[PDB]
Structure 1
Amino acid sequence: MREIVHLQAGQCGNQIGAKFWEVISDEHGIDPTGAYHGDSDLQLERINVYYNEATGGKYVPRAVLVDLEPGTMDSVRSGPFGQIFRPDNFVFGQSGAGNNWAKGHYTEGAELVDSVLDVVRKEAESCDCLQGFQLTHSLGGGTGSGMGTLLISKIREEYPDRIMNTFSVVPSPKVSDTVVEPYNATLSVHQLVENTDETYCIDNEALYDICFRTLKLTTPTYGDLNHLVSATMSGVTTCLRFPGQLNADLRKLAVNMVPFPRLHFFMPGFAPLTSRGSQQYRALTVPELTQQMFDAKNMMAACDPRHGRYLTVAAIFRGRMSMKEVDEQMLNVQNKNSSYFVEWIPNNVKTAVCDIPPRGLKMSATFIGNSTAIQELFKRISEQFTAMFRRKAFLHWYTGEGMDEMEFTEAESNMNDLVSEYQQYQDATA
């Protein structure tokens, strides 16, 4: 029961997804061939959350891999843990999106989404109790931004009551990987604010600082970054898969983390994160884990929480700990930083403690934050969008696929409303 169906999209999503299943399979003891060789029996009790069983002990991920080009999937199946996936779930086209939201959404993915849903429904109908859908993509491209948002709309229209959570890689402020990021991002956000319950925003620039400052990693590959993203993805779905003192279902987080419907954008974090040479200088106890979780330099999003206030916060601990330490430390953070927390919410921390930690770590903790400071990200995108849109920078590529300038204005207006809404609820009562 409480099954999760994973849905890939684009190059970024597939790359992260491949790493995600490498991590998930590791903690569940699944070999790359699909066989189970774990030690503990607790990792096999709730294996149905992510995997479907087959004859001979083969466990198949409940994952759908989709992209408009064959290359990224071909890399996925060739790489480690690539044969674990079911071949029928590789729903791909031939002519890719050129990093334009219009093509992936209206022109290219429109003729392929119907096939994708034929695999999503088949996976969904095989669940004893469907909990939600898990989507990994990027907002800065065409396929993930365009095609991913198209699937979100289709599923939310077909499964209204199931929780939809997205792990989106957000464009960075410092430098870009694509000239048309503002167009792709603004249009994609127009669909997320309406058809998802919790989106975990992450930017590559922030992850570079984590590798540079904390991990002291001098040659950070994209595989290294995907490991950090995979860690937080696994953390938010541990209470479904392992026992714990105080459990926290995905919906249990949404209620505690989403006061108003549209303020559901989170910036994640993880701990412990230390370099190889500095590991022998750490106590590795609850007091210090909570000390760095709330640090602005350990969050995988660019926005600094110091520039705004936290509406809500979640700390999903893993490993055997003293619940007194967790409750006291969370309260201690609340008291010291009372200026950083919205006052009309008396308690701003949701605590979850899972008994089984990740492999190789005695203790671990994942940080989730719904902060009013995230409006900085959206407002920065709006400034970039209006500058390009003010003189029709690239619309002929988008309008050539069927879009209209009216849609761009609607997307911009909705983004401004969201930024304003975040500012409204940043002020005290009366």
Structure 2
Amino acid sequence: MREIVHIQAGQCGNQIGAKFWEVISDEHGIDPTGSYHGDSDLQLERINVYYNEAAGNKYVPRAILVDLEPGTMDSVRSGPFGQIFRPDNFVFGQSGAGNNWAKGHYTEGAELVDSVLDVVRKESESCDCLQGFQLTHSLGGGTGSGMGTLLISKIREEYPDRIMNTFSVVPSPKVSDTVVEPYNATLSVHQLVENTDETYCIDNEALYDICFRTLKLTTPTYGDLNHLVSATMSGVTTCLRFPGQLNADLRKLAVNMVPFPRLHFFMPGFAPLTSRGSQQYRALTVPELTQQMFDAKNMMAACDPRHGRYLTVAAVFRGRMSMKEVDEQMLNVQNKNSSYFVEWIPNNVKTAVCDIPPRGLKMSATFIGNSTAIQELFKRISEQFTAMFRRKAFLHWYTGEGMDEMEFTEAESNMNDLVSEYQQYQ
């Protein structure tokens, strides 16, 4: 019931997605062989949301792998739980966008995606009660962004009544990637806005800082950044995995998180998020979760809430917490920090509670929300982009693929509109 299909848009999606599945598999008691050997029926009651049931009492990750890099394919085939994952879902072409979104959307992506979609259709036709899709991709990358954007548009046309939940890596102020990152991001954002219902932005600098400083992992490798991202994704999916005092769902979040259709971007974080030595200096009570959840510096974003306004916050808790305990803390926060919440809503905090904690924590919680601080993302993309674009830097990469400059004009304008709405609510 309320099944989800996942898409791993290239290496971005595969590294994040792979960790997601390692975590989720552990949460459901799923062995490296795929067979279930867990502790409770609760692990099976909703396992079909994320896995395909099979003989041997096996649960196969319900995901599709998409890229133009066969090296990635082999790398994924060689990884953990690879023996479980259905071989039919390795949808890899052999070329690569070359960091050219148009090539990755209009041309190479255009051919690849119809193969991917035939797979998506077969996967969706294997579901009984499909609720939606969850896809992880980057904005400014090549094949990942191209295919991500392209699949989201085509999937939306085929499944207009399903949820489109997008997680993505977005441009940073210092730690950049491709030479045309701002072009690719500009093009991608424009196309994504009209098709995505819910999305979470990922700033690598924040992940690096949380690992470096918060977790005191002063060597914040990609594997550690994946912990933070997969932990968030896992957090978001709690409602489709385990029950509690206040049951919830993704549709409830949409109805109570997006007051206006364009305000669907999220800047997530979670708690407890500590190091190892620090385990001797903590108290896993709701007030602790609360302080971390509403800590502007604990979010996986450069979009520091102290420079914006919260438009809507969702506080999702896991573990046997007291509801008076939780309610008073949420109220205390809004009263103390009222200057940071939008005046349009006479309650800016949504609460949901799962009685089952994540493995290893007495208590935990996930904090997500939409804030006017988000405009910093779009301003960075726009400034980086407009500066390069006005010099027609790399323009030949796009016009050579048939892209009209008009496409960029429209995309830049779109981001200005996203910013304008954040400003209207601030």
Provide the TM-score with structure 2 as the length reference: 0.98
CA displacement at 1:374 relative to structure 2: 0.5
Residue 48 of structure 1 deviates from its aligned partner by: 0.5
Secondary structure, counterpart of 1:137 in structure 2: strand
SS at match of 1:263: coil
Which is worse superposed, 70-79 or 266-275? 70-79
Output the CA distance in 2 between the equivalents of 1:95 and 1:143: 9
Matching residue of 1:188: 188
What residue number does 1:233 align with?
233
- Give SS of 1:210's match: helix
In structure 2, what is the equivalent of residue 75 of structure 1? 75
Match of 1:147 in 2: 147
User: CA–CA distance in 1 between the matches of 2:328 and 2:103?
Assistant: 52
Three-state SS of the structure 2 residue aligned to 1:201 is strand
Distance in 2 (CA, whole Å) between partners of 1:73 and 1:16 is 15
- Count of residues paired in the alignment: 426
SS of match in other structure, 1:239: helix
Q: Distance in 2 between matches of 1:153 and 1:418?
A: 19
Question: What SS class does the counterpart of residue 80 from structure 1 fall into?
Answer: coil
Show CA shifts across 1:373-403 (max 9, x none): 1001101110111101111001101111121
Deviation at 1:271, TM superposition (A): 0.8
Aligned residues of 1:134 and 1:164 also touching (Cα < 8 A)? yes
Q: For residue 343 of structure 1, report the CA deviation from its aligned partner.
A: 0.6
- The CA deviation string for residues 231-282 of structure 1, in whole angstroms up to 9 with x for no partner, is 1101111121111110120111111110101111000101101111111110
Q: Indicate the residue corresponding to 2:387 in structure 1.
A: 387
Distance 1:270 1:100 in 2: 34
Give the Cα separation in 2 of the matches to 1:346 and 1:9.
Answer: 39
**CA deviation after TM superposition for structure 1 residue 218, in Å:** 2.1
Native 8 Å contact 1:319 1:354 kept in 2: yes
Q: Is the 8 A contact 1:14 1:73 kept in 2?
A: no
Deviation of the 1:219 alpha carbon: 2.2
SS at match of 2:237: coil
Per-residue CA deviation, residues 288-337 of structure 1 (Å, 9 max, x unaligned), is: 11101111111001111111101100011111111111111111111001
Q: TM-score, normalised by structure 1?
A: 0.98
CA drift of 1:213 comes to 1.6
Equivalent residue of 1:238, what SS? helix
Output aligned runs, 1:101-120, within 5 Å. Answer: 101-120=101-120
Residue matched to 2:261: 261
**Distance in 2 between the 1:46 and 1:39 partners?**
14
The answer to whether the 8 A contact 2:149-2:188 is kept is: yes
Cα RMSD for the two superposed structures: 0.9
Q: CA deviation at 1:134?
A: 0.2
CA distance in 2 between partners of 1:262 and 1:278 (Å):
40
Deviation at 1:175, TM superposition (A): 2.4
Aligned to 2:307: 307
- Give the deviation of 1:220 after TM superposition: 2.1
Q: Check conservation: 1:341, 1:348, Cα contact below 8 A.
A: yes
Is 2:212–2:219's contact at 8 Å kept on the other side of the alignment? no
The answer to whether the 8 Å contact 2:66/2:147 transfers is no
2:210 alignment partner in structure 1: 210
Deviations 1:197-226 (CA, angstroms, capped at 9, x unpaired):
111001110011111221001222211111
Q: Give me the whole-angstrom Cα distance separating, in 2, the residues matched to 1:84 and 1:299.
A: 33
Q: Distance in 2 between matches of 1:177 and 1:196?
A: 24
Q: Secondary structure at the match of 2:152?
A: helix
Q: CA deviation at 1:49?
A: 0.3
CA offsets, 1:28-84, max 9 Å, x none? Answer: 011121111111221111110001111121211110001011112211121112222
Runs of 4 or more above 2 Å deviation: none
C-alpha separation in 2, matches of 1:23 and 1:190: 32
Between the aligned partners of 1:43 and 1:151, the Cα distance in structure 2 is 31
Pick which of 381-390 and 211-220 moved more.
211-220
Q: CA deviation at 1:167?
A: 0.6
**Contact 1:257 1:313 survives alignment (8 Å):** yes
1:154-175 deviation digits (Å, cap 9, x = unpaired): 0111111111010101111122
Contact kept? 1:18, 1:82, Cα under 8 Å: no
Query: What SS class does the counterpart of residue 246 from structure 1 fall into?
Result: coil
What is the match of residue 88 of structure 2?
A: 88
Deviations 1:398-419 (A, max 9, x none): 1111211111111111111111
Q: Aligned residue for 2:222? A: 222
Question: Does the 8 Å contact 1:68/1:95 carry over to 2?
Answer: yes
Sequence identity of aligned pairs in percent? 98
Partner secondary structure for residue 284 of structure 1: coil
Distance in 2 (CA, whole Å) between partners of 1:243 and 1:8 is: 27
- Give the structure 2 partner of residue 4 of structure 1: 4
